[PDB]
Design a protein around this nucleic acid. Structure first.
Ligand SMILES: [Mg+2]
Ligand SMILES: [Zn+2]
Ligand SMILES: [Zn+2]
Ligand SMILES: [Zn+2]
Lengths: 112, 559, 269, 107, 171, 88, 97, 187
DNA sequence: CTCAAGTACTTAGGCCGGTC
DNA sequence: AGTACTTGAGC
RNA sequence: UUCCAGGCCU
C-alpha cells in the first residue's frame, strides 16, 4: 500500500506539469525503492549501499571511502554491473551485450 | 593497444577481489629498496639515484631502460617499490575501524568480549553479512569492558563456566588526532586507581593486540584470513607508487617537474629516517614519539589530506598538496571523470544551424571536419579500387584519406610519406579515409538526458562551418540556433557503426517510450505554414502545383 | 541520482527485470512485458455506457425474433435462428464480455476507459475495411462459430512469457488479461458483423495481424529499462517550469524518503 | 494470539519464545479497530506452502535473496501471521496487465 | 613413466579462415602449437592422439575484432621425468665432468661425482670415454640411470642422475 | 559450481524471434567478419559493402552464427540465426 | 571532446553495447597490462621479447594473462594500491550465482 | 593471444601459491599426475602409465591412423609392417615425415628411443604383459617401470622401483618378473 | 537507558585570463 | 548550505 | 601541465 502511495505521489509530481510518463517507468523506480523491504531512498544513504559490487557504488558519492571498506571487508565484484565494465573497459552485459555469438562449424559447411 | 604483441593469453576481468596488502607482499612485489628521499640526480649528474624515483621502478626520459623490462615509457606500467617504515602507522582510512575493532576485542589476549556464551551475541554472530554483522557485533560488546573468564553456562545460571582468561578491564577508547586513547578504572575511593587512568595507544601496542586476535574471530567480525586481516589495517611497510602515478612533469632539460605526490613521499621518507636515527642512536626516548607522530602524519595525509584535525599539510606556497583520495574523489575523480566519462578521439563540435532541405536523419557536416575525422577501413577486393583512389587521392582533396596502415603495425602518413603517390594497397591493410556522404555518426546535444539526445544520422558532407541538421529532430536534442553547438562522434568499427545504424538511427528514436508517443514532428515554418496551406479558403492554380508536385521526391509523377 | 540508481536494470531473457544481483525488480517488465514504444490510447468500450446500451451492442440471442442477427448481416442468419447449440457459444461470449465489464469497473474504479494498450485495434480494422473494400450492404459469411471460436484462439497466441509450466503459464494469463478484454470488446460477435460487416477473410486477416502485431509489441530482452525509466522521468523534470508542496522540490522530497514532508495533508473520505 | 488493551510487561513479553514450537503473537486493541487489509490500497497477499515456494524458485531460477522482500513487522505481515522465510503472493490490479502477480519473502 | 593426459587449448582463429576447412585448419593449428611442445606442468608433449575425434566445440566470436576463440579439447602422449625415476638410455655427449645420457626426448646428465670412482675417465679417448675394471662407456654404450633431479627449462626439461647405486650403470 | 552447462535446445524457453540487439549485433559481427575478408555465403549481386552482405546473408539465414542467450543465473539457451525469426 | 557520464548513460539506454566500449577504449584510454594469475595485481614483469614473465614475489613466470582495460583504471589501481588497497583481477570466477 | 595448454582439473588457486609438493619416485608425482585425475569426459579415471613399447604402439598407432584422415581429405598405401627392429627405425622414420610436424625433433627422437629400448614389439604380447601387471593394485607408475625396465631379482626390482618394497612380496614379484623375461618378445 | 548536539557529504555539466 | 545518519550526555 | 578567477550555453 506504500508502493501504491509512493507511485501515487510521484505521478502527481509529473502530472502537475501535465507532462505524461508511461506507468512502467515510474513504477520501476517506485518498485526499486520498495522491493528491498521498506522505503529505500534514492541517495548516497539509500540505494548506493546495497550489496551491489563495490566498484559500481564507488562511482557515486562514497567513492574512495566505499573502496576502502571493500579492501577491509575483502569484497568481491561479479562485474555484472553496468559500471563495473565501463571502468574495466569491457563490453557490458547490456542489450547488444546480453549474449554471446558463436560460429557453428555445422552450419558453416551446409552453406557452400 | 599498448602495442607490441605478447604471447600472453588474454582475457577479461570477471571478478574483482578487494583486499589489503601484507607488509610482506608489499615487499615481495617491490623492486625498489627506496632509501633516499632525494629525487635522484646522481648528485647533480643527471640520471636517477638508486634511492627514490626509479631506483629500478619505471623510468623517465624516453629510455628502454627500466630494470630490463625495457619497453620505453608506453608499455612498461609502473613497478612498485617499498619503504620499510620506522614504526607502525595507522592507515588514515581504517582509523575508525581500527578503533571500532579495538572497542570490540580485549588487549593482552585478543579474544572477543562476547563468546557464543552470550546469546545476544549469537544473534549477531549469525547475521550473515560481513558488515551488518560487524555492525551488531560491535554495538554489542562495545560496552562490556572486561575480558571475562567466567559466565553463567548453558545450564543453571548458578553453575558458571570459563572460557578465555585475562579479565583486565578495558578502557573506553576515543578518537583524537591520528592516535587513540582510553581510560580504565578500578574502584573509586575504594582500593587504588579511582577516577580514570589515561593511557595512549601506541600503534605497536594495537597492531600486536590485533595480530593476536583469533583466526575465526577475524572473520567472526567482518574480515578475511587471506585478503584483509585486521592486523593489516596498520602499515608496517609502505608500497611506493612508481613514476607513472606521480609523473615528473619535466620542463625541457636540467629543469624541475616532480609530481605533488613524489614530494609527499620524499616528505614521508625524511620524516622516517629522522625517526629511525632518533632510536638507533641518542634516543631522548619520549622525545622521539614527538618526531614519530610526524611520520604518522605524512603517511596519513599522503593518502587523505582533507581531514578533521585541520592542518592541511600545505605544500609550502599554500597549496594543500593533493592527497591520493582526492584524486579519485567524485567528479573529476579518476572515477567519475575519467572512467565513467572520458575525453575522446574521433569527435567534433561546431555551431548548429537548422536546414529544411535535409532528410530528417541526415546531418550537414562541414568539409573542414569531413577531412579531419577518419574511419579505419580495411582494404578489401571490394573497395580496393575506391580505396586506392582516395589514398592516392590525398588527404587534402575532400573525398580522400590521410593514413594507410600495412599489416606490420606501422602507419604511413599520407600527408608526408615520400611514397604517398605510390602505395599499392593490400587486402588486409587499413586505410583511415575521410568521413563520407552517408557514414553513420552519433550526433548529440548535451545535456544528454534523453535516450534520443544522441541519435545516429547520415553524413552529408557540406560547405560552411556548421552542423546543419534537419528541423523536426530539433526538439529531441533540445536544440536551438541562437549560438548553440553540438558534439558528434564517429564510429570506428564495422560492428560499431552497425550498432548506431541499427539501433540509434533517428528514424528509430522517432516514437518514444517515455510517453508511448512520437518525440519529433513538424514545427514552426512548416507547421505555421502547413495550416495556411490547408484551409478550404486556400487554392493553388496549375504552374505552382506542378512545381509543388515535383518537389516531393517520390511523387508518382502523375498530376 | 535516478540513473545511477537504476543503471543495471534490464529485461532478461526470461522477461524478468533485474540488476547485477539477479535480484528481481519486476517479474514481467511494466507488468505486461510490452515495450512502451508500441502502445496507444485504446478505448475499452466494455466498461462505460449504460447497463442498457451494453445489451443493444453485445447481446446476440438466436432464440428470439428481436435479439437475433437479422440475416442481412450474416449469411447463415435465418438458418441459425433458434439453434440452441450456437446460443450456448453465443452465451458464453456474452457471459464473458460481462465478466469483463465487472472486471474493468474493478481495476478502473474510476470509470475511465482510455488507456495505453498494445496493438491498435481500431486502425487494424480500419484498414481491414478498405483493404477488402467491404460493402456494408451485402451480408457477411462467418459463423457464430467462425467469430467466437477464432477469437478464442487469437488469445491462445498472444504469448508474452513462454515457460512450459503452471507458475509461468499462469503468469502469462495475468500479464495479458487486460489486452484480451480490449480484444473481446472489439471482436464481439454482434460488433464484428453488424458494426463493420467483416467478411470471413477480412476477419481471418485482422486476427493474424493482431497476433504478430502483438508479438512485436512485446519487450526485447536487452532493453536497459533502468537507465531508461530514470531518464524518462528525470527528463520531464528539467522541463518543469515551476497550497501543497508541488513538483520539482516535492519530487526531491520524495526520492529522499522525506523524513517529514513540507505539506503533509491527509484527505479522508 | 493475544489482544492487549494498553500494553504488556516488558518482563512478560520476554517469554514468547518460551514454548517452541508453538509460538505466540502479540497484538494491540486500538490497533485491530479497523482492518488494514481492507484498505483501498493494500492488495491481497497469500502464504505459500514450502512446496508453493520451492516451486516458485525452481520456476524462476531464483535464490532466496533475489526475491523482493516484506518486513517481518510489515502490517500485513502480522495479519496473516508471516514468518521469516515464508513467501507471499501479492496479487493486485494493474493499469497495464489488469492483474499482476508479485512475490514477497519475509525478512 | 610416459603418460597420456587429457588437455585443452584455447586457439583464436581469424575470421579470414571462417571457411569450410575450419575444423581442418584448427586441428592443424592445435598440432602446430602442441606436438613437440614442453612445459614444467605437463613436460614433453609428444603426440596428440585420435586425430579424427578432436573436439572443437562452438568457438565464440571475440568482441572488437571478429576472431573466434575455440577451446580445443584434446588428449595426447607425454613424458615428464621425476626425481628417483629410473630410466635407461643411450649416451650422447661425454666430457671431463661426465657423460650426458639421452633417455627419450630428454637428456639426463651424470657427473663424475655421481658414478663409482673406480670408473676412471679416459682422456686420449677416440671417442671420449670412462673406464673401469670391466667397464667402458662412450658414444652409444647404453646406460641405466637414476634421475636424481629435474630442471624444467625453456622447452626442455633437463635433469641429472647417478649410476653409483646398485643394479645401476651399464646394461 | 554447475558444469551442467545449460538448457538443451529442447525445453528452450526464451523468445522464438530475434532481439533488436541480436540482429544488430549479428549483422555487425558478420559484417566485421566479411570486412575482415571472411567467406561470404550469398551471391553478392555487387554489394561491395559488408553490412550489406551481412544484411543479405541474414535474409537467406545463411549466417553461420549461433546466439548464446544467457539467463539471470548462468544457464543459457542456444539459438541459430536460422531458428530465430525476423519480424525485427 | 568529452563523452562524459551523461552521454554514457545515454548509450547504455540505447543498448549500444560495443559502441560505448569502443568510445571508452579505442577512442581514448585503451591500454594493456599483464596479470599474475594468482595475486590479481599488475606485478608482472612483462619482457615481451624474451617472453620472461616472472612477477616474482608471487613467483610465477608461467601462469599469466594479458588484459585490455583503460589506462585510467590501470592508474586507478596502482592509485588504490598506493593506499595499501589490493584490487585483484581475476580472468575467471568462482562465485557463480 | 596464444593460450598455454590448460589441464582438466581446476583447483581454485587463491593467493596462497605456497605449497607445490616435491616430485619423487616416492609416488609423489605432481598434482597433474594423481591417481585420481579427471577424464575430459568429466568422469574420473585412473592415471595412465605407459611403459616403453606399450607407448611406442600408442604413438605409431594414432600416428598412422592419422596418415589416413590425411588422405581421406587429399581426395575431397600404408597398412602396417612386421617387427624387424632396425628395419623399423626406417619404417617409422618415414611415417613421421608425413604425419609429423617435422621439426618435432622430440617425437622422432622419442620414437628411436622407444623403438630401440622397446620391450615387447608386438600388440598381443603387450596386452599380455598388461593383463599380468595391471592386476597388482600396483600404482600405474610402477606398472610402467616394471613393464619397461628389465629386471631379475626382487632386489633389482624393488630397488630401481623403490615405491614397491612393502607393496608386493619378493617371491610373488619375483614370479611376475620371470613371467616378463619370458614374454619378453625376442628380437 | 532514551534525548539533543556532534560529525560528515555532495552541491549538474559541456566549452572558452593571472601565475603554482 | 541542508540535511541526514551518529555520537555524546544527563539520568 | 598545475593552481585560483571570470565568462558563455534566449
Ligand atoms: Mg541557445
Ligand atoms: Zn618496466
Ligand atoms: Zn583479555
Ligand atoms: Zn604475482
Amino acid at each position: 500500500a506504500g508502493r501504491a502511495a509512493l507511485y501515487k505521489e510521484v505521478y502527481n509530481v509529473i502530472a502537475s506539469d501535465g507532462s505524461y510518463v508511461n506507468y512502467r517507468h515510474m513504477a520501476l523506480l517506485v518498485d526499486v525503492m520498495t522491493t528491498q523491504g521498506g522505503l529505500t531512498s534514492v541517495t548516497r544513504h539509500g540505494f548506493n549501499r546495497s550489496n551491489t559490487g563495490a566498484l559500481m557504488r564507488c562511482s557515486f558519492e562514497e567513492t574512495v571511502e566505499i573502496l576502502f571498506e571493500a579492501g577491509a571487508s575483502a569484497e568481491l565484484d561479479d562485474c555484472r554491473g553496468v559500471s563495473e565494465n565501463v571502468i574495466l573497459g569491457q563490453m557490458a552485459p547490456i542489450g547488444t551485450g546480453a549474449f554471446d555469438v558463436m560460429i557453428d562449424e555445422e552450419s558453416l559447411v551446409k552453406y557452400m | 593497444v599498448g602495442q607490441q604483441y605478447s604471447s600472453a593469453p588474454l582475457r577479461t576481468v570477471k571478478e574483482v577481489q578487494f583486499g589489503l596488502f601484507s607488509p610482506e607482499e608489499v615487499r615481495a612485489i617491490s623492486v625498489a629498496k627506496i632509501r633516499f628521499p632525494e629525487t635522484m640526480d646522481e648528485t647533480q649528474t643527471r640520471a636517477k639515484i638508486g634511492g627514490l624515483n626509479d631506483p629500478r621502478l619505471g623510468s623517465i626520459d624516453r629510455n628502454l631502460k627500466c630494470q630490463t623490462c625495457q619497453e620505453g615509457m608506453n608499455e612498461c606500467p609502473g613497478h612498485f617499490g617499498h619503504i620499510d617504515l620506522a614504526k607502525p602507522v595507522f592507515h588514515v582510512g581504517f582509523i575508525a575501524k581500527i578503533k571500532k575493532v579495538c572497542e570490540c576485542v580485549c588487549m593482552h589476549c585478543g579474544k572477543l568480549l562476547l563468546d557464543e556464551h552470550n546469546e545476544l551475541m549469537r544473534q549477531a554472530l549469525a547475521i550473515k553479512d560481513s558488515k551488518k554483522r560487524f555492525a551488531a557485533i560491535w554495538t554489542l560488546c562495545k560496552t562490556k569492558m572486561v575480558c571475562e573468564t567466567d559466565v553463567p553456562s548453558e545450564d543453571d545460571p548458578t553453575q558458571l563456566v570459563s572460557r578465555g582468561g585475562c579479565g583486565n578491564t578495558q578502557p573506553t577508547i576515543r578518537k583524537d588526532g591520528l592516535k587513540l586513547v582510553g581510560s580504565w578504572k578500578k574502584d573509586r575511593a575504594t582500593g587504588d586507581a579511582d577516577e580514570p587512568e589515561l593511557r595512549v595507544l601506541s600503534t605497536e601496542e594495537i597492531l600486536n593486540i590485533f595480530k593476536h586476535i583469533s583466526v575465526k574471530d577475524f572473520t567472526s567480525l567482518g574480515f578475511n584470513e587471506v585478503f584483509s586481516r585486521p592486523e593489516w589495517m596498520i602499515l608496517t611497510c609502505l608500497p611506493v607508487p612508481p613514476p607513472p602515478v606521480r609523473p615528473s612533469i619535466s620542463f625541457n632539460e636540467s629543469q624541475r617537474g616532480e609530481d605533488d605526490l613524489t614530494f609527499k613521499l620524499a616528505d614521508i621518507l625524511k620524516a622516517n629516517i629522522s625517526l629511525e636515527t632518533l632510536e638507533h642512536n641518542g634516543a631522548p626516548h619520549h622525545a622521539i614519539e614527538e618526531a614519530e607522530s610526524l611520520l604518522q602524519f605524512h603517511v596519513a595525509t599522503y593518502m587523505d589530506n582533507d581531514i578533521a584535525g585541520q592542518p592541511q599539510a600545505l605544500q609550502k606556497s599554500g597549496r594543500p598538496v593533493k592527497s591520493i583520495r582526492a584524486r579519485l574523489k567524485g567528479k573529476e575523480g579518476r572515477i567519475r571523470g575519467n572512467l565513467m566519462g572520458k575525453r575522446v578521439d574521433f569527435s567534433a563540435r561546431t555551431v548548429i544551424s537548422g536546414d529544411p532541405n535535409l532528410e530528417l536523419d541526415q546531418v550537414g557536416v562541414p568539409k573542414s571536419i569531413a577531412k579531419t575525422l577518419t574511419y579505419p577501413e580495411v582494404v578489401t577486393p571490394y573497395n580496393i579500387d575506391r580505396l586506392t583512389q582516395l589514398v592516392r587521392n590525398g588527404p587534402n582533396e575532400h573525398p580522400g584519406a590521410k593514413y594507410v596502415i600495412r599489416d606490420s603495425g606501422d602507419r604511413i602518413d599520407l600527408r608526408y610519406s615520400k611514397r604517398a603517390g605510390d602505395i599499392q594497397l593490400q587486402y588486409g591493410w587499413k586505410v583511415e579515409r575521410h568521413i563520407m556522404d552517408n557514414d553513420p555518426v552519433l550526433f548529440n546535444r548535451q545535456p544528454s538526458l534523453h535516450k534520443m539526445s544522441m541519435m545516429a544520422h547520415r553524413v552529408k558532407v557540406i560547405p560552411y562551418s556548421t552542423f546543419r541538421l534537419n528541423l523536426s529532430v530539433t526538439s529531441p536534442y533540445n536544440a536551438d540556433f541562437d549560438g548553440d553547438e553540438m558534439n558528434l562522434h564517429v564510429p570506428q568499427s564495422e560492428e560499431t557503426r552497425a550498432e548506431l545504424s541499427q539501433l540509434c538511427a533517428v528514424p528509430l528514436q522517432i516514437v518514444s517510450p517515455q510517453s508511448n508517443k512520437p518525440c519529433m514532428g513538424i514545427v514552426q515554418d512548416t507547421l505555421c505554414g502547413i495550416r495556411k496551406l490547408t484551409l478550404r479558403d486556400t487554392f493553388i492554380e496549375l504552374d505552382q502545383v506542378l512545381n509543388m508536385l515535383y518537389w516531393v521526391p517520390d511523387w508518382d509523377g502523375v498530376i | 541520482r535516478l540513473v545511477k540508481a537504476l543503471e543495471d536494470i534490464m529485461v532478461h531473457y526470461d522477461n524478468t527485470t533485474r540488476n547485477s544481483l539477479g535480484n528481481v525488480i519486476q517479474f514481467i517488465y511494466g507488468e505486461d512485458g510490452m515495450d512502451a514504444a508500441h502502445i496507444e490510447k485504446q478505448s475499452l468500450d466494455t466498461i462505460g455506457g449504460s447497463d442498457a446500451a451494453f445489451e443493444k451492442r453485445y447481446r446476440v440471442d438466436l432464440l428470439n425474433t428481436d435479439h437475433t442477427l437479422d440475416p442481412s448481416l450474416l449469411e447463415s442468419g435465418s438458418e441459425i435462428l433458434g439453434d440452441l447449440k450456437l446460443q450456448v457459444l453465443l452465451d458464453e461470449e456474452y457471459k464473458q464480455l460481462v465478466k469483463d465489464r465487472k472486471f474493468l469497473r474493478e481495476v478502473f474504479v474510476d470509470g475511465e476507459a482510455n488507456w495505453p494498450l498494445p496493438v491498435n485495434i481500431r486502425r487494424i480494422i480500419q484498414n481491414a475495411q478498405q483493404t477488402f473494400h467491404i460493402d456494408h450492404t451485402k451480408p457477411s459469411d462467418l459463423t457464430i462459430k467462425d467469430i467466437v471460436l477464432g477469437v478464442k484462439d487469437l488469445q491462445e497466441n498472444l504469448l508474452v512469457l513462454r515457460g512450459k509450466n503452471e507458475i509461468i503459464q499462469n503468469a502469462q494469463r495475468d500479464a495479458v488479461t487486460l489486452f484480451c478484454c480490449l480484444l473481446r470488446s472489439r471482436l464481439a460477435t454482434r460488433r464484428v458483423l453488424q458494426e463493420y460487416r467483416l467478411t470471413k477473410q477480412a476477419f481471418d486477416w485482422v486476427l493474424s495481424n493482431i497476433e504478430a502485431q502483438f508479438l512485436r509489441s512485446v519487450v526485447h530482452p536487452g532493453e536497459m529499462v533502468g537507465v531508461l525509466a530514470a531518464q524518462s522521468i528525470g527528463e520531464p523534470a528539467t522541463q518543469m517550469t515551476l497550497k501543497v508542496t508541488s513538483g520539482v522540490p516535492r519530487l526531491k522530497e520524495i526520492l529522499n524518503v522525506a523524513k517529514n514532508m513540507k505539506t503533509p495533508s491527509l484527505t479522508v473520505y | 494470539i493475544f489482544v492487549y488493551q494498553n500494553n504488556i510487561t516488558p518482563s512478560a513479553m520476554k517469554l514468547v519464545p518460551s514454548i517452541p514450537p508453538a509460538t505466540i503473537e502479540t497484538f494491540n486493541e486500538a490497533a485491530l479497530v479497523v482492518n488494514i487489509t481492507h484498505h483501498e490500497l493494500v492488495p491481497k497477499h497469500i502464504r505459500l506452502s514450502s512446496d508453493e515456494k520451492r516451486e516458485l524458485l525452481k520456476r524462476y531460477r531464483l535464490k532466496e535473496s533475489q526475491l523482493p522482500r516484506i518486513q517481518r513487522a510489515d502490517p500485513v505481515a502480522l495479519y496473516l501471521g508471516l514468518k521469516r522465510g515464508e513467501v507471499v503472493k501479492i496479487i493486485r490490479k494493474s493499469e497495464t496487465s489488469g492483474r499482476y502477480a508479485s512475490y514477497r519473502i519475509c525478512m | 613413466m610416459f603418460f597420456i593426459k587429457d588437455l585443452s587449448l584455447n586457439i583464436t582463429l581469424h575470421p579470414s579462415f571462417f571457411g569450410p576447412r575450419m575444423k581442418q585448419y584448427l586441428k592443424t593449428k592445435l598440432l602446430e602449437e602442441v606436438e613437440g611442445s614442453c612445459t614444467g606442468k605437463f613436460g614433453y608433449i609428444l603426440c596428440v592422439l585420435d586425430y579424427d575425434n578432436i573436439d572443437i566445440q562452438r568457438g565464440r566470436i571475440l568482441p572488437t575484432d571478429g576472431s573466434a576463440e575455440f577451446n580445443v579439447k584434446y588428449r595426447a602422449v607425454v613424458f615428464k621425468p621425476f626425481k628417483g625415476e629410473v630410466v635407461d638410455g643411450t649416451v650422447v655427449s661425454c666430457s671431463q665432468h661426465g657423460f650426458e645420457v639421452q633417455v627419450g626426448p630428454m637428456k639426463v646428465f651424470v657427473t663424475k661425482h655421481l658414478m663409482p670412482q673406480d670408473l676412471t675417465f679416459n682422456a686420449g679417448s677416440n671417442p671420449p670415454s670412462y673406464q673401469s675394471s670391466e667397464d667402458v662407456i662412450t658414444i652409444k654404450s647404453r646406460i641405466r640411470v637414476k634421475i636424481e633431479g629435474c630442471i624444467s627449462q625453456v622447452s626442455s626439461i633437463h635433469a641429472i642422475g647417478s649410476i653409483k647405486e646398485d643394479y645401476l650403470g651399464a646394461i | 559450481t554447475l558444469k551442467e552447462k545449460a538448457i538443451p535446445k529442447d525445453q528452450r524457453a526464451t523468445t522464438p524471434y530475434m532481439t533488436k540487439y541480436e540482429r544488430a549485433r549479428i549483422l555487425g559481427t558478420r559484417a566485421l567478419q566479411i570486412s575482415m575478408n571472411a567467406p561470404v555465403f550469398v551471391d553478392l549481386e555487387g554489394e561491395t559493402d559488408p553490412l550489406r552482405i551481412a544484411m543479405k546473408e541474414l535474409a537467406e539465414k545463411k549466417i553461420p552464427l549461433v546466439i548464446r542467450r544467457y539467463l539471470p543465473d548462468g544457464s543459457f539457451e542456444d539459438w541459430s540465426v536460422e531458428e530465430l525469426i525476423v519480424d525485427l | 571532446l568529452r563523452f562524459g557520464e551523461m552521454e554514457r548513460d545515454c548509450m547504455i539506454a540505447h543498448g549500444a553495447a560495443s559502441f560505448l566500449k569502443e568510445r571508452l577504449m579505442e577512442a581514448s584510454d585503451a591500454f594493456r597490462v599483464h596479470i599474475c594469475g594468482i595475486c590479481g595485481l599488475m606485478t608482472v614483469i612483462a619482457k615481451l621479447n624474451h617472453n620472461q614473465f616472472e612477477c616474482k614475489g608471487c613467483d610465477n613466470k608461467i601462469d599469466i594473462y594479458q588484459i585490455h582495460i583503460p589506462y585510467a583504471a590501470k592508474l586507478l589501481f596502482q592509485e588504490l594500491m598506493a593506499m595499501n588497497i589490493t584490487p585483484r583481477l581475476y580472468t575467471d570466477r568462482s562465485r557463480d550465482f | 593471444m596464444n593460450v598455454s595448454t590448460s589441464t582438466f582439473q581446476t583447483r581454485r588457486r587463491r593467493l596462497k601459491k605456497v605449497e607445490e609438493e616435491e616430485n619423487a619416485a616416492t609416488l609423489q608425482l605432481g598434482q597433474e599426475f594423481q591417481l585420481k585425475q579427471i577424464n575430459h569426459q568429466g568422469e574420473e579415471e585412473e592415471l595412465i602409465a605407459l611403459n616403453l613399447s606399450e607407448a611406442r604402439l600408442v604413438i605409431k598407432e594414432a600416428l598412422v591412423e592419422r596418415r589416413r584422415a590425411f588422405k581421406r581429405s587429399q581426395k575431397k598405401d600404408d597398412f602396417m609392417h612386421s617387427e624387424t627392429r632396425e628395419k623399423e627405425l626406417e619404417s617409422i622414420d618415414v611415417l613421421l615425415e608425413q604425419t609429423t610436424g617435422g621439426n618435432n625433433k622430440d617425437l622422432k627422437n622419442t620414437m628411436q628411443y622407444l623403438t630401440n629400448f622397446s620391450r615387447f614389439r608386438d600388440q598381443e604380447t603387450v596386452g599380455a604383459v598388461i593383463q599380468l601387471l595391471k592386476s597388482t593394485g600396483l600404482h600405474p607408475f610402477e606398472v610402467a617401470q616394471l613393464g619397461s625396465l628389465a629386471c631379475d631379482t626382487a632386489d633389482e626390482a624393488k630397488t630401481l622401483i623403490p615405491s614397491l618394497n612393502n607393496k608386493i612380496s619378493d617371491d610373488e614379484l619375483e614370479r611376475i618378473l620371470k613371467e616378463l623375461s619370458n614374454l619378453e618378445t625376442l628380437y
